[PDB]
Design a protein around this ligand. Sequence first.
Ligand SMILES: [Mg+2]
Lengths: 49, 207, 113, 113, 57, 300
Amino acid sequence: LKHGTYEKLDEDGLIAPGVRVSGDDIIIGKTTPIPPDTEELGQRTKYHT
Amino acid sequence: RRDFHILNEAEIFQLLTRETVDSFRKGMVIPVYVRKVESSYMSVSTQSLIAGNIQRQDILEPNDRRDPREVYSVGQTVRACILDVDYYNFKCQLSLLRQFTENQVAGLNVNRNPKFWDIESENRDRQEEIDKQREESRESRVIKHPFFHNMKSKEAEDYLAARPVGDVVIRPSSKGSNHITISWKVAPQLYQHIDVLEENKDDANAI
Amino acid sequence: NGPNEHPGAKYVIRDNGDRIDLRYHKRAGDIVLQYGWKVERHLMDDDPVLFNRQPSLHKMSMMAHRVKVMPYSTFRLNLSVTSPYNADFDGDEMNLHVPQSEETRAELSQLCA
Amino acid sequence: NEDYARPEWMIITVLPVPPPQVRPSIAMDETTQGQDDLTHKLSDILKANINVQKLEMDGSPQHIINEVEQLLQFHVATYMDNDIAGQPQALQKSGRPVKAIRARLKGKEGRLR
Amino acid sequence: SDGKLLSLPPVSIYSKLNLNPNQQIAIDSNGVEVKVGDTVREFTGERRQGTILHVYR
Amino acid sequence: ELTERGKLQIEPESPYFDFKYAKNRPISALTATPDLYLRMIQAENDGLVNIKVELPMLSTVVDHFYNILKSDGTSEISEKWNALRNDAWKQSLDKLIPLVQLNVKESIRRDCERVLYFQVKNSFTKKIDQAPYQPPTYAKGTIPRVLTLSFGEGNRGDAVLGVFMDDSGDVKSQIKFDEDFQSRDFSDSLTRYIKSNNINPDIIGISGFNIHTKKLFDKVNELVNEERLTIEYDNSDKHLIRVIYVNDETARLYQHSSKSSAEYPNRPQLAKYCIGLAKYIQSPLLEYLALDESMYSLHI
DNA sequence: GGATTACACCCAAGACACCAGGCACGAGACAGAAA
RNA sequence: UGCCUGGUGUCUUGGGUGU
DNA sequence: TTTCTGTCTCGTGCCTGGTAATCC
Ligand SMILES: [Mg+2]
């Protein structure tokens, strides 16, 4: 993840108008899928996909 | 064959904590990790995840009247001595009193009977190593002054011998780096060494 | 003082070469400095710095000045030095280079001043 | 020089393959990374070498041998110099000329300058 | 930890002792905490010194 | 005796500190404590200490043999002859002492080694002497159906793995519990797995690497006590399914052995660990045999 | 024929192996066939 | 006791800024 | 029509190679 803050994003991954933003803040939240690793061994669904 | 062997409290403790009952019992000192500080108790964690607690009577010295939070904080690990062990529940109580954390040195139960143990040899080696500890190192002092000269008492007197009456030389003193010996010619073949005590010294070589 | 308060520091470097970042340290007050360590302190007053303008036609285009920390966002020059730099204040920009050693600081203060 | 520069060493019989540090790959997007130009040129050279070896052992029409060996010579030559006057340059699939090793070292943006 | 040397196949070894900094903690004679990689000198004996590699008990 | 290396290296925490200054230790008592003599020999081989064997009445034997050997003459010539005989006898004693000391040392070494060998043999026999767990209402020696549940460490992100094996010794089904073990969902899913699928394990084994497994064991025991998960008995005070801890040296070694990987190429390491635990419960002897060479590295 | 033609800095915008065709695994549906 | 993240394409092209 | 099923089409998958001065 980026070192900025994701707390200003809404549920849909987009910031809302009227919100003050600073440098390095995340204004668009996007993720790309990755083939899962062998973490399904003992991770309680908390594995990076 | 005998029936299946069921682990008991000691076996379960050894299996889980990987610590033997002998190596973790009363009268042992371990470097536990402070996890939570409270006014009436402190909650600490050992190396082997064994959660421990100390009642307020032992975090601070009985003479001191300070607060536990001021002296000790989270993340500040300290030495502790085991008082009680709850093997079934993996709970232990500790003491921070120096009568345990410091005085407990010869924790081994080796029989020191003079018939079979050479107490005299161990004692002699003990003063040998203690004298070795007392041994230190010392070096010379360097001072920048027109009338300062790194000479002995006799050396200073001989240096002033070739000079007329009243000339002054300055040399390091034998009483310490905080002292200075000043030698001046009182009379032909007569010299006075005066010790000067230094105060508020910036450095050993400094004035 | 930390990396946000002037005068401050950014890093503490141990003898072995490890860098301690003061932004991400929760126990900055619990750091004791030993002799021989390095502290990457902030730029302060009277620090020699090399100052330069392009194109560097001659050797007077790089000269070492003494730092004075000031508000607002522009470098400030005495107007007598605008001739060797061939600079005026209609939008020109100039480069500043910080020496990183005692030897280099001495060279700047004794040769390029 | 007998020890250092022997005349027959001017003909290449074994080619040194530089490490990936010399020809690093670049991630064009979040998923697909791009092979470097030198990597593609080395792949072409190795394919030509395999082709020559396969052709030699199976059956030897001299015309085919001449064509394939001339292709190998062209690939090896353009891997180190892609500005040979008098013949067309090696081109990428995008149509741009291949950045040979010689082009890496010359110009304002080359290695030396 | 005893000071002896052993030779064993990789299979025979149990596992690596992964310890967090909250577990790998060292305290010197004076009680000052010493962390991984710090340089300490033996108080007695050969009085050697070196950098800490791992802390256990 | 202590060399300079012994004078400096024998620390209060070192195991050699037990005999740093021992003196006049009886030989006859050494055989009852072989490890002390073995450790003394080991320290000697390290160039730290020197073991010396001496007799309190050596002078008595020397004088007796001299009296046997000495002449009874009183003349100065006889005095010179007796002096020569005594000096030669002392030289002979000087030559003879080291060989006898070495022979006695070797004898005691062999005795202590044999004693410790027998002790290790008995310890290993005690370790490997245990019949498989006997389920109630069954004769001894019956192989029980077993279910193993484990999560390893218990850090945030540690799911609980379950592996069930029948009496045949073949894996029947493996399940993952991806919810928190303290949630109602975990208990409900475990109860559904236990009851609905007709698994009916005779005993449930729980093991781990740290104390976090204790909470899982307590939670499982509470669940068993709450849902009255009695064992199915083939055709009436039905007995509850037992939940115990399991020793896991063989399981730990099996989770790293390539034999498991060949046997189970598409299974996690924790699944292999649970399978090893289940096989150990079914038959400890065969699991101890499966160690092959790594059995010698067990703490016996 | 070959080689080279000032220095530094800023920003924005458009492209970067695609593909097609022959070879494999699994599956399933609608029609065969006895009763 | 629930406990904190540093890792950023490349190649072309265009338009600009100070001399 | 009920029931067991065949077997050949076909969805899903994939391998892997074709395709402007000047100057010396
Ligand atoms: Mg201007």
